Amino acid sequence: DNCEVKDPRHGNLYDLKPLGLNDTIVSAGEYTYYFRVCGKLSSDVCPTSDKSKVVSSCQEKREPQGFHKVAGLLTQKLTYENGLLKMNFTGGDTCHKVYQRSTAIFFYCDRGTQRPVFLKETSDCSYLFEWRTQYACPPFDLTECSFKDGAGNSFDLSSLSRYSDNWEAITGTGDPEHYLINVCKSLAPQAGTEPCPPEAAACLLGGSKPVNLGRVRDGPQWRDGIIVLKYVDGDLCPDGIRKKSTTIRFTCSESQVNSRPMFISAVEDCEYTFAWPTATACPMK
Numbered sequence: 703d704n705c706e707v708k709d710p711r712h713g714n715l716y717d718l719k720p721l722g723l724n725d726t727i728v729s730a731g732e733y734t735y736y737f738r739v740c741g742k743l744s745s746d747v748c749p750t751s752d753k754s755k756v757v758s759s760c761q762e763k764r765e766p767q768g769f770h771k772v773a774g775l776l777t778q779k780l781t782y783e784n785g786l787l788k789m790n791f792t793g794g795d796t797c798h799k800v801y802q803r804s805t806a807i808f809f810y811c812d813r814g815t816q817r818p819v820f821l822k823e824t825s826d827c828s829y830l831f832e833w834r835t836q837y838a839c840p841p842f843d844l845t846e847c848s849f850k851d852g853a854g855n856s857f858d859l860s861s862l863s864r865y866s867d868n869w870e871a872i873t874g875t876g877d878p879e880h881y882l883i884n885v886c887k888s889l890a891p892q893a894g895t896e897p898c899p900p901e902a903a904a905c906l907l908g909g910s911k912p913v914n915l916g917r918v919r920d921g922p923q924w925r926d927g928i929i930v931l932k933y934v935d936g937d938l939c940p941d942g943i944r945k946k947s948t949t950i951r952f953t954c955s956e957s958q959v960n961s962r963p964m965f966i967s968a969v970e971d972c973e974y975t976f977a978w979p980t981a982t983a984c985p986m987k
């Protein structure tokens with residue numbers, strides 16, 4: 703009800719009503735999809751002589767030889783299920799005799815708001831869309847991610863900051879553990895029932911419980927001839943005095959446009975080290 707749902711891990715309240723100010727129109731091949739977040743369609747499409755139905759989503763095969771199919775009825779239900787924000791307009795026109803068309807929007811956290819995109823139609827005639835929008839973001843920590851070297855060259859790692867997912871570090875194929883990392887921000891929300899601590903910018907998964915390997919503090923800087931980003935104040939180290947920390951060493955490699963951080967070392971379950979050759983770490987022009 704009411705186009706809102708609370709995040710059970712962060713406590714913030716997602717409110718997608720600003721996305722329902724107007725009809726949303728999405729082209730997908732020969733189709734145009736119309737839907738209204740938490741409201742009735744105002745567009746002159748998908749007429750129904752059944753008054754008890756309030757149409758909120760419409761699939762239009764454009765002319766020539768066009769047609770309209772009701773793809774979902776009015777709902778203000780927004781669900782948050784194991785880390786995923788979804789809205790499902792149900793009750794559309796009959797499909798393959800035993801189904802009814804539906805329209806499902808998956809909302810993902812984004813730096814801004816991108817136009818929604820049609821993904822696929824499921825075998826039960828559910829039309830799946832993704833919508834990347836800042837409205838789907840729980841709170842996160844963020845630091846400046848641009849910097850200079852001593853010679854005045856400029857650098858910016860901001861494009862490695864990921865809002866809807868996280869970087870999975872590359873370990874040996876035998877490693878039963880895996881590492882999630884983000885850049886100049888805490889981790890993006892994760893699907894599942896075992897999420898990392900909300901304050902973590904780096905996290906160790908595979909043990910009994912996720913482990914926070916450090917929080918955002920300061921941005922990246924050139925130190926001793928290497929670009930370094932450090933996360934601090936993770937979970938307590940086993941010695942009981944220090945808190946876990948993570949160092950990411952970046953190096954410029956123009957060919958490395960879709961690289962991932964590589965796990966280098968974990969010392970005393972306390973200091974974690976990653977190395978990341980990336981075209982993003984090269985001097986800007």
Ligand SMILES: *[C@@H]1O[C@H](CO)[C@@H](O[C@@H]2O[C@H](CO)[C@@H](O[C@@H]3O[C@H](CO[C@H]4O[C@H](CO)[C@@H](O)[C@H](O[C@H]5O[C@H](CO)[C@@H](O)[C@H](O)[C@@H]5O)[C@@H]4O)[C@@H](O)[C@H](O[C@H]4O[C@H](CO)[C@@H](O)[C@H](O)[C@@H]4O)[C@@H]3O)[C@H](O)[C@H]2NC(C)=O)[C@H](O)[C@H]1NC(C)=O
Binds near residue numbers: 790828830
């Ligand atoms: C958005 O929301 C909509 C609405 O919920 C989702 O659409 C539904 O998707 C599910 C798939 O996840 C569909 O389930 C399958 O449905 C088929 C067809 O079921 C119909 O025909 C059957 C054959 O005659 C009949 O038995 C069914 O009757 C049962 O279900 C209805 C409710 O739909 C209920 O009223 C009846 O009393 C019965 O309980 C029905 O008329 C079915 O064949 C599938 O069954 C297989 O799998 C299930 C496990 O999933 C298993 O239990 C079965 O034994 C069988 O192995 C399966 O149930 C569903 O039909 C869709 N609903 C409609 C109205 O089309 C949509 O997916 C959502 N989108 C997103 C992205 O979440």
